[PDB]
Ligand binder design. Structure first.
Ligand SMILES: Cc1cc2c3c(c1C)C(C)(C)C[C@H]1C(C(=O)O)=C(c4ccccc4)[C@]4(C(=O)NC(=O)N=C4N2C[C@H](O)[C@H](O)[C@H](O)COP(=O)(O)O)N31
Ligand SMILES: Cc1cc2c3c(c1C)C(C)(C)C[C@H]1C(C(=O)O)=C(c4ccccc4)[C@]4(C(=O)NC(=O)N=C4N2C[C@H](O)[C@H](O)[C@H](O)COP(=O)(O)O)N31
Ligand SMILES: [K+]
Ligand SMILES: [K+]
Ligand SMILES: [K+]
Ligand SMILES: [K+]
Ligand SMILES: [Mn+2]
Ligand SMILES: [Mn+2]
Lengths: 500, 500
């Protein structure tokens, strides 16, 4: 089966790519696996596969770290993401995000139910497993639990059966048969949870599948619209109906090739201690435990020689940056276009800790709108910050057509030189904020409200008559024939490969 | 003579350092020399020495580009700056800025007058030179003139004789015996010019010395206090009295080893077209010519085989970043300390196009002040933005003790995660602004006023009880013994030199 449709095949793809380090000597899931993975993420090294995890029993489990993190080379920087999607390993960010958006104007391709798959090779009933006895990692030294769930997919369905959501949300072991985790507004797992709570009759049927088809974990990390079943969106994007098997203990359906599946319920009434956790923005607040949602596990099924993917998240660069930021930016690009705004490209610069999105403006279209910065900033921020796709983003930077938003240095240049602090910005205090950002939940103001801004790095003539500068750079401040002569004589004169 | 005291010796030092490319074939001063130099600056290559400049006659002149730009290696990144100051080539930014500040609490060491020096080896009187016939560079394709002056020192003295200022300000050729250039508030050349204008009796005696002692061009680029003669400050910093010779046609004194000296007057009444120029923030606005100050040249003296230093300035990284930004930041650090503010370090991140300064706070001292963000931001911004040392800086970022302000990635991390937009910021609209920033002079508001901000990236507990987080990074979220084990086993496991 293809790498984008089968996690086991994805691991083989990383090996073939010379992008895997297999570690066959004993590694402790208490911090060691995650420390190695953290080092990998901070240095853009090969992904680690821990084949000999201290505490692994009866097949549960090996760990793959850094599944969606960056490669060292510029030419295949995003190759691990490309390998989630059947794209060439040299694919650009633009090409990856376009692939992720391509299903948004296609009919869904609903999944196909099959009678069995590798995820049924082994099972443990409620008398046979204990989550406290598995080699669940302690990911950061101050975490408030062992975070089993950093790269699996939660599966919950609306009470009326019409929407099945797949998403990533963290969860940690509570006791032998429970997890606690984040379930917070406006996330779809929370929206669905609320539907069950208002119905008031039963806990939410739930499954958590680890080592799912890579294309499915990508959509799990993307804020596709309310009501849209991720499986059919992935089917459309990949051109293939995903094969799913029914859970044993409930009527949810999981990918046939899932490495590990937990089946059970998400409580509509119970909570338990959750966190703290070393989060996407690079911080942990030791001791800041709060009550989180509580999951009961009734059954485990798993592949022979199951592999658990793990994100050792925090400071740059890991899945919480490459996937959360970029996929939010993609959805924001589309949202803006659907609201008739002249946005061509969007990206969350890593330098911003993926709290900014830079929006590239088609300034020919902007000029035709015969508008102003104040008005335009207001319109953009209203669209984005009132929508779920804008949840994680606290600063929008509007830039003109000369800026490549996928290049952080160029975004920082434009922001620092073209947006006058205060005057060229509009603050938004009556929008939902992301509490996980330290300046929100641990800051001076409301944890859940405000703290957002549109920063307009469009110059005045971009609204009127057109760009009225040239850059003072090699590219723009010298004629073509001279530039080429300089380049052609560069090594001859005594000065200093694409792939590397 | 030492490299820090003699420009010719500095050029030899760069050669010895394997940090020079000598180009002995003909190079056109019309764009080609500056294009090569621009490429060097954008790639951190070796400095170019153009020994065969088309139009060089009777010894005027060779060009050295990129004299204060960066080296490629991390270990000697700032080595060219270190070579201005007799520091080891591995000197840190902190060490360079401390050297530049060291004279601020020392007695001046006044200069020594000597009867002659190399700068008197050749001369051209007013019947013998024509500035339009020298190989003056066109630095950017849209510049409004040939900018002879990008790395020399203007020398002007107060009418009462008590202050002699040395500074860098650009100037271009106007005609055979005049330059035009920027002379703008609050710069010392402008302050002195104003004194002569109010006296109303004569034009300002002036000299412009190119290829001065490297320690002197550093102080020329630094906003040392009003009234302080740079020569005595350099003397103190270097521990040696600078040797100066008298001009032939006026009573100013120039460094004995200056490569090229122009003597004449800065008019108190005349102006001429100046600019546009590709400036420090990375832009040129073609056609934006404005009236500038007008200089009359009466005499040229020069060394045999004179070398003109040239900054091909614009986008990162060149002298306008390494020297303007860093030296402003140094002076701001000292200013803050002298105003009893608990600042330990300051740097202008290159990523900000040197429009920001990050201020590292001693948060033990801050806690003892029993203050708040609003109050502290206000106090810091009042000190800095009401002072000349703050002129070029539009954003101050306050960070706590865990942030290395000399590392832009860490400044950007702290700004993006710890400063809530709006709430954690104070805008300053009634301060002098830097018109050269595009969002000022070519922006939506007053060109010369406002557009400044203090952004407080101190977390709330840094004002009260102390830091209450750990970073989710390799360094902070794993114990020492584990980190060391990981590092020791890194290459053994299969993962990937200081000098490179
Ligand atoms: C990739 C990824 C992702 C994620 C995550 C992760 C990862 C790796 C981890 C590691 C686990 C971390 C964590 C966190 C931390 O940082 O901790 C986080 C946060 C983030 C932001 C926000 C808030 C939170 C999470 C949780 O927990 N919760 C939630 O909520 N979310 C989330 N995410 C996101 C998501 O996935 C999206 O958003 C979609 O979109 C969903 O879907 P829908 O369907 O709903 O749309 N997480
Ligand atoms: C290093 C350097 C420096 C500079 C420069 C340069 C360089 C290389 C060039 C290339 C030539 C460029 C130019 C520009 C452009 O960019 O164009 C500029 C600007 C900048 C900012 C601001 C405004 C302007 C100059 C002019 O022009 N003007 C002035 O004013 N200034 C200046 N600078 C600064 C200075 O030097 C300081 O500031 C001190 O400090 C002085 O001294 P005192 O004594 O007064 O204190 N420049
Ligand atoms: K999703
Ligand atoms: K603007
Ligand atoms: K100066
Ligand atoms: K703050
Ligand atoms: Mn969803
Ligand atoms: Mn001065």
């Amino acid at each position: 089966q293809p790498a984008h449709l089968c996690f086991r095949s994805f691991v083989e793809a990383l090996k073939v790519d010379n992008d895997l380090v297999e570690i066959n000597t004993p590694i402790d899931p208490n911090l060691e696996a995650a420390a190695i993975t953290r080092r990998v993420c901070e240095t853009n090294d090969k992904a680690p596969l821990f084949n000999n995890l201290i505490g692994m029993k009866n097949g549960l489990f090996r760990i793959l770290g850094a599944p969606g993190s960056l490669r060292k080379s510029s030419a295949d920087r995003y190759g691990r993401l490309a390998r989630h999607l059947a794209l060439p390993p040299t694919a650009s960010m633009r090409e990856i995000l376009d692939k992720m958006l391509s299903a948004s104007d296609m009919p869904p391709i609903p999944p196909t139910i099959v009678p069995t798959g590798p995820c049924k090779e082994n099972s443990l009933d409620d008398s046979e497993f204990d989550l406290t006895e598995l080699p669940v990692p302690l990911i950061h030294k101050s975490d408030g639990g062992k975070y089993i769930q950093t790269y699996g997919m939660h599966i919950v369905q609306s009470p009326d059966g019409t929407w099945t959501n797949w998403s990533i949300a963290r969860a940690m072991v509570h006791d032998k048969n429970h997890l606690t985790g984040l379930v917070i507004p406006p996330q779809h797992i929370w929206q669905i949870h609320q539907m069950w709570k208002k119905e008031g009759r039963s806990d939410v049927p739930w499954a958590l599948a680890f080592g799912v088809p890579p294309a499915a974990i990508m959509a799990s990390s993307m804020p596709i619209p309310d009501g849209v079943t991720e499986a059919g969106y992935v089917g459309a994007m990949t051109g293939s109906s995903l094969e799913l098997v029914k859970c044993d203990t409930n009527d949810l359906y999981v990918p046939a090739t899932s490495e590990i599946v937990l089946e059970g319920t998400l409580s509509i009434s119970e909570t338990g201690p959750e966190g703290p956790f070393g989060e996407m923005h690079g911080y942990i607040f030791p001791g800041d435990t709060h009550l989180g949602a509580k999951y009961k596990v009734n059954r485990i099924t798993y592949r022979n020689n199951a592999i658990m993917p793990m994100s050792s998240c925090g400071r740059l660069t890991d899945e919480t940056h490459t996937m959360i930021g970029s996929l939010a930016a993609a959805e924001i690009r589309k949202l803006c276009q659907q609201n008739d705004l002249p946005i061509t490209d969007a990206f969350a610069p890593f330098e911003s800790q993926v709290t900014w999105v830079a929006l590239r403006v088609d300034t020919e279209k902007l000029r035709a709108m015969k508008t102003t910065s104040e008005g335009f900033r207001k319109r953009v921020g209203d669209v984005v910050f009132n929508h779920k796709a804008g949840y994680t983003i606290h600063r929008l930077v509007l830039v003109g057509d000369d800026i490549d938003v996928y290049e952080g240095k160029d975004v920082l240049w434009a922001f620092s030189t073209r947006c006058r602090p205060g005057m060229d910005e509009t603050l938004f205090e009556d929008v939902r904020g992301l509490p996980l950002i330290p300046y929100m939940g641990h800051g001076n103001g409301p944890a859940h409200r405000g703290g957002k801004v549109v920063s307009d790095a469009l110059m005045p003539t971009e609204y009127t008559t057109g760009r009225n500068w040239e850059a003072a750079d090699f590219n723009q401040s010298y004629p073509e024939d001279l530039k080429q002569k300089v380049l052609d004589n560069w090594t001859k004169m005594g000065f200093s490969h694409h792939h590397h």
